[PDB]
Symmetry: C3
Subunit: 116 residues, 3 copies
């Protein structure tokens, strides 16, 4: 079904709008993302450098989204159950950090060869 694509596309924009509204950390990163994305589109670099500059930052977005989905499950569980170790939320937090450290290292290495 071709309409199945427009359906799953609907479920997506719903989760993008809901991430931007409820999740605060998603908003700040989205700023640094669209900035960096634009910067990459105007930097005089090669298609490999440009893609690597854009994708590394967009990975932060993807990971944060998966982190928000996990938290929504812990919150769901937290409504029925009383105690929460919050260890699942701690692991999803680390994943986002590693994505950021990655994008930072990516941008530095790529720009210090470029500007260097």
């Amino acid at each position: 079904g071709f309409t199945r694509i427009i359906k799953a596309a609907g479920y997506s924009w719903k989760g993008l709008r809901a991430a931007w509204i409820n999740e605060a950390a998603f908003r700040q990163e989205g700023v640094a993302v669209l900035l960096a994305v634009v910067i990459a589109c105007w930097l005089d670099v090669d298609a490999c450098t440009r893609v690597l500059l854009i994708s590394s930052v967009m990975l932060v977005m993807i990971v944060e989204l998966l982190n928000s989905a996990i938290e929504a499950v812990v919150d769901r569980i937290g409504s029925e159950y009383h105690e929460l170790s919050g260890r699942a939320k701690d692991l999803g937090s680390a994943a986002v950090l590693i994505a950021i450290i990655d994008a930072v290292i990516t941008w530095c290495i790529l720009l210090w060869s470029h500007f260097g």
Copy 2:
């Protein structure tokens, strides 16, 4: 664990079959074109990422369904959030191929 989940996602998820095709297709096309290593890697890694995310999405959807048969605001929020991550990976793959191939 590994092969049990890839055969489960293939038999069940229709969008995963379309990505499995896409991954292998990407590997081929990346190998045919006269491009350098980094280009070939980016051509493949981008599509493989879409698959990696879609698997994590289906993993979450599996948990949401196992928690309760009942839809909650927070459970619906979970599914939609993961479904959005897949889109970004798809778009990221689209951007990747465009920047690389327009330059070629």
Copy 3:
């Protein structure tokens, strides 16, 4: 600046937990620093050096998200008394594709370099 310090602590607590508990994570931690060392020491261009480190770091990201899902299934599987590891499977499947992707990357990158 108070929310940022709070989140980074959650990340250290998460990293320290994954290290102590998950053996596969310790192997991947070794892999990252080793990937970094190998990628840097080789007279290698920027994009390749990034891709050599990025690909291995991506593995660590998926392993962490996987272990996060595993923790949720185990909170359920403790209070639900019903175990259908459909989720734990799909998680490990993702990490595998991350690893395959990493090997391919290192292959194609290092193959072209020494070509």
